[PDB]
Structure formats: structure tokens, C-alpha cells
Design a protein around this ligand. Structure first.
Ligand SMILES: O=C(O)C[C@H]1C=CC(=O)O1
Ligand SMILES: O=C(O)C[C@H]1C=CC(=O)O1
Ligand SMILES: [Mg+2]
Ligand SMILES: [Mg+2]
Lengths: 366, 366
């Protein structure tokens, strides 16, 4: 189980409909397929989604850091030297998805080598997660229509509404329309992607005080430090930190500083080894955690569910596992299936997925 | 890899020389051998040391909780459902070594089933740890003689001196004698096992200010809450919490409250699943951690080194891995070997140990 090579292949798949939010937009999945090859002939895979408006990574940059720094530093290690790989990669600052992809591909290879799913190796608490869908910006009537379509089609009963627009009433009207249309039959929460000021955020949440929102996520910039802390202290529900807590150290600083009262865990940025560190830190501190979506393709979603199903604290909440549906196509030989508002972790070893050679050949851009 | 049975066998092995400390004494290893049997014919093992003066467990009590509560609740689970086992056992409060032993025996069985060492499955950072020996109470001249014997015989260069006696000068004289006898060729730190008051502790440490002590461990009771916090804030070096932080929640309360500035990790009380939770919490908070000794037999020591070698943060410090030497005999077919002041993790799958049938038959007390 020795790593003989690590590759980074850029690919691009158009979105049927772009996902828009306060911090940016995604019109295509311009990701990087990361592959870890072992001396046993096994190939572990994962993807790295470049999100310049979240981490500052670019597709070109991810391929570069992997080919120029990480691959050379990890070749020669075995799949059971994860902490050596973790420590070596840590010598390089940032580059979250590049690091996470390598870690997850290593876990995929390990699982295949041992005939065990990543989920069970991590803890195997359960076999499925409830699904939460992120509703991107769009005309009010269109967002409600999208929610209705998704709920009826896939049985999804949890929605995270993208907000952070002006005037604030535009978003509060959308959330109210959703609650009036579905009643208490659905769970609702919001994500502002740093779009509102702390003051606007409070006014918005106060207006929606009767809508039973479960969480408030990154309503204002965490970097508006003092006003952010004041806002978090004013809200009843937990305030989920996401882009502001990419590492365990950030979790500690933001939580102890009062700028976060809940934590988003995204395998796209902390993989499995790093995500376990976040889960354990959050559980130890006593904070709620939710599996988030990095506007993942099916490869990344398979990773999210692999980790989320491994622990009780992550599976007690719905996981954001459905935005891949807006992609026009994907790279798996067998597409992920969401039914009854749930997504099961794959039954196969590792991530339980396989890359379709024809799809990769068609969408790769190298 | 399904668990078909879990047994708890009490055994007793006399100590060649008793280990004495502020909170109690150990004259024999009256432990419990815990065995996890799988449907593959594999048997994972671990031990549970009853320490009434530390956790309140008794040999009889450990066997009882395992046979009456834990075994019935875990039979039927697979070795890859560790989080289910963790959650089910958590329904019962306390009983740390009983829980830890089951967890470690499960990991041992898993390793054997996969032909992988526990160390590598946990992270595989390194293959060995430097060794630290705990020097129990005894005449000043005799403690120095013991240190000299151990250093020359095994190459051990780190010693944790047991203190907490009155007058305080008795212990400070011992530590000074050790530093004068060995110079800077050895690492030294102290453990008071709650024996001194916070005021006595400060006076003692001030008297030893020129002895370059690396850590101060549980000098006074953590339950002398406010004076404990004042003391911790007065000391230069990290103050290791041990018996006061048996769970991650305790780590959080004691660290945020200021009663601890370093954390002892003992596999005897948190096993491997729980110990990973402690390591990740401590690393995330940014605190030093040291692998401690629960006055372990060789079975427990094999567990300590399995975990300690898996991570960088634990292996950067010497691990307390040598007090089993004072036992008159043990249960392994192949005894642990300490050379050049180091202990390597076992090369075999799981814990890399095997119970000698003849030894178990002779020392069991059921
Ligand atoms: O913020 C989210 O949870 C969803 C998405 C928006 C940007 C991003 O990278 O993640
Ligand atoms: O305190 C230590 O580190 C050593 C020992 C003393 C009591 C116990 O159970 O552990
Ligand atoms: Mg978010
Ligand atoms: Mg101690």
C-alpha cells in the first residue's frame, strides 16, 4: 500500500443552471480530479473544487501545488502513514481543497485495499443521512418553485436558503414564502455568505423570528470582528461558521472569541483526517456541527456522506448533499441517488465510487 | 468481523516491589483481562487496571459492568461500528478502564483481522517512543539509586518523580539530588497525585526553580478549585492534569477554567477511540499532551505505545512506558523490551501481542 504517484487532472462540466450566492457564483464545475496510485495497482480518487471567493484557490493553482509540492513530498509513504502525510502537507499553508483531496483519495485507496468503506473505517455510526438542499439566489417565486420541485422529486425536507441580498426584505420575504408554503413540514435555515452587515443581519433575523429558523450561517463577515461577535450574542439559534473556520485553529479562535456558536464541517476543505480533528474539537467544546456543501460534484458528495454517516454528531442533522443535481453531468459510473430525502453511504469499499473513463476523457481540460 | 462474545477475566500478579505515591499504593496487578471474540475466530485483548484512588473502579466492579452491561450491549456489532459501541457505552457513566479495555480489545481484533498494527491504523506517525519512568516514594538515597539503575540498565533518560509528601523539603531534596547526580543528561518532572495543598506546591516549585523541571503534574487537588487555578497561573512550565481530566468534557472545563495547562493522555482510561478525541481536542485548543502510565502491566503498555507512536504531538515527548518492570511476571508470550531508552510499537497486527495460556491459567482468580 505504498504511494507510487499522485495526479491532478483538471476538468470542467457545465451547470444546467448556475448557483448564485452573496460571495460569488458557480456556472461550471471547474474542478480537479486527484488520484493516488499505489504499488498494489489501486487508485484512490477525490476532487478539489477551486473556490477563489472562499479559500482563494484556483483550478490552475490546485494542480500546481499538488504536482510541485504535495506529490513529491508524499510519494513513498504507505496508506497507513496518514499522520506523516498530514504533517508534511501542513508545512504548506492554506491550499485546503488540494490537501483534502489528497487525504480523501488516500482513504479511498485504503478502503479499497482493505475491502472496507471509508464510512465504516471512520466509525460506522449509521448508513445514511437526511439531505439538505441549498437554494441559490433567484426571483422569489422561482426559489419557492425550486424548493417545491426538489421536495416532491427527491423527498428532501430541509433547505438552506441563500441570503445576503439588498434590500434585506427581499430575502426575508423568500424565507417567509417558503414557511407559508410548506408549514412545519420542512426544516429551514439561512446562509448569508458574508453578504449582510451585522446590523442588517439582526434586523433580518428579527423579522424572521416567527419562522423557526434552525441556524444562521455566516450572515455577515467574520472579519467585521466586533460587530460579528455582538450579533452572534444576540441570536437565539446557533450561528454556523463556515468559510471563517477552515482549520481547527480557526474553530478555536472563533468559538472562544464569540464569533461562532456552531461549526460547518466540509470534507472538501478538511478531508477525512482533518474533518475528524474538527469533529472531535467541536464535540469536545460542546458545539453543534453540520455537514456542509462546497458546491460539490458527486465525487465530493460521496465524501461528505462517507464522513457524515461515521459519527452521531454529524448524522443527527441533515447534510448538505444535493447541489450536485444542478450539474449537467458528472464523472461517476454510477450516479448518486437521493430518495425519501436521504442519501445512503456507498456500499462499496473506499468511497464506493468509480470514475467513468469516457466521462473523464470528455471533460478533462489538460 | 462481528462480535460474538466479550469476556472479563480477573487476574493477579504480585509486584516485586510496591509502587507508592500520594494517592495510594500498588502491591499487585489485580487487573482484568478483557477479550473480544469475533465470528472469524479472532480474539482481541486488553487489560483494565482498577484504580479506586483514581477512578473509583474495583476489580470486581469492572468484571460486573462488563458482564452485566457492556457485553450484552455490544455483542452483534462489527469491528467497524466503533462509534456505535462508543455511543452505547457512553449511556453508562464513568467506568473508564472497563470501557477503554473493550475499545482497545476491539481495535486489537480489528488490526488482526486486517493484518495492520493499531499504531498504523491510528496514523502511523512513527515507530517508537522515548521512555519515561515514574519513580515512586522511597528513601531519598533509594530513589536516586533506582533512577541510576534504570538509566544504566535500560537507557531511560526521562524520569517523573512522585512527590506530594510532607515535609515538602523531603521531595524537593530528592529532585535536587537527581539533578545533581545526572546533570542536564536527563529530563525531569514531578507528579504530586493531589498530595500537596496549592500553597505547599508553589513553595516546592519555587525551591526547585533552578532544577529545570519540564512539567508539574497534579501537585494539588483539582477540586481545591480556586487555589488550584491560582497555582497554575503562577507556574512557568505547563501543569499537567491527569486524574482530573478523565474525559474530553473535563479537558474542556479544566483548561478553560485555568486549572490545567497540559494534558495527560492514558489509554487505560480513554482507550484508542476516546484517546483520539482527547488528542484532537488538546491539539485544537493548543495544549501539550503526554502519554501517561496507569501503573500498567505489559498489556496496557503495549496499548500506550500503540497510540503514542501514531501521532506527532504525543511522540514529541517521552511516554511513561516502564513501570511494568516492577511486576514479578506478566501475561505476554513475548515480553516488552526497552533499549536505549526507547520502546518500539509492536511489529505484529493489532497490538502485536499474545496472551500466554499458561500464565493466564496460573494468575487468573476466577
Ligand atoms: O457557503 C456554503 O455553505 C455554500 C457554498 C458557497 C460558497 C462555497 O464555497 O460554499
Ligand atoms: O498519576 C500517575 O500518572 C501515575 C499513577 C498514580 C495513580 C494512577 O492511577 O496513575
Ligand atoms: Mg455556508
Ligand atoms: Mg499522574
Amino acid at each position: 500500500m505504498k504511494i507510487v504517484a499522485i495526479g491532478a487532472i483538471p476538468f470542467s462540466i457545465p451547470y444546467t443552471k448556475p448557483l448564485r450566492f452573496a460571495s460569488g457564483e458557480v456556472h461550471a464545475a471547474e474542478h480537479v480530479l486527484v488520484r493516488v496510485h499505489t504499488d498494489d495497482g489501486i487508485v484512490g480518487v477525490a476532487e478539489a473544487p477551486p473556490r477563489p471567493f472562499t479559500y482563494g484557490e484556483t483550478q490552475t493553482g490546485i494542480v500546481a501545488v499538488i504536482e510541485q509540492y504535495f506529490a513529491p513530498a508524499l510519494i513513498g509513504l504507505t496508506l497507513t502513514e496518514r499522520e506523516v502525510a498530514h504533517t508534511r502537507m501542513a508545512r504548506t499553508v492554506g491550499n485546503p481543497t488540494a490537501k483534502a483531496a489528497i487525504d480523501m483519495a488516500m482513504w479511498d485507496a485504503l478502503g479499497q485495499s482493505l475491502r472496507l468503506s471509508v464510512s465504516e473505517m471512520l466509525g460506522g455510526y449509521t448508513d445514511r443521512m437526511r439531505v439538505s438542499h441549498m437554494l441559490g439566489f433567484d426571483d422569489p417565486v422561482k426559489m419557492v418553485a425550486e424548493a417545491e420541485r426538489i421536495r416532491e422529486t427527491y423527498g428532501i425536507n430541509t433547505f438552506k436558503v441563500k441570503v445576503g441580498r439588498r434590500p434585506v426584505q427581499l430575502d426575508t420575504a423568500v424565507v417567509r414564502a417558503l414557511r407559508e408554503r410548506f408549514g412545519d413540514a420542512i426544516e429551514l435555515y439561512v446562509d448569508g455568505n458574508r453578504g449582510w452587515s451585522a446590523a442588517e443581519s439582526l434586523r433580518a433575523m428579527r423579522e424572521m423570528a416567527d419562522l423557526d429558523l434552525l441556524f444562521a450561517e455566516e450572515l455577515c463577515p467574520a472579519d467585521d470582528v466586533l460587530s460579528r461577535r455582538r450579533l452572534v450574542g444576540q441570536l437565539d439559534m446557533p450561528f454556523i461558521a463556515d468559510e471563517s473556520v477552515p482549520t481547527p485553529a480557526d474553530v478555536t479562535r472563533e468559538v472562544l472569541g464569540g464569533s461562532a456558536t456552531a461549526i460547518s464541517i466540509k470534507t472538501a476543505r478538511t478531508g477525512f483526517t482533518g474533518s475528524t480533528r474538527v469533529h472531535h474539537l467541536a464535540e469536545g467544546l460542546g458545539l453543534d456541527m453540520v455537514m456542509g456543501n462546497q458546491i460539490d460534484g458527486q465525487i465530493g458528495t460521496a465524501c461528505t456522506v462517507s464522513f457524515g454517516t461515521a459519527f452521531e454528531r454529524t448524522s443527527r442533522h441533515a447534510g448538505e448533499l444535493s447541489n450536485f443535481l444542478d450539474m449537467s453531468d458528472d464523472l461517476l459510473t454510477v450516479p448518486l441517488q437521493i430518495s425519501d430525502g436521504q442519501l445512503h453511504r456507498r456500499p462499496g469499499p473506499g468511497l464506493g465510487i468509480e470514475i467513468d473513463p469516457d466521462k473523464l476523457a470528455h471533460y478533462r481540460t489538460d
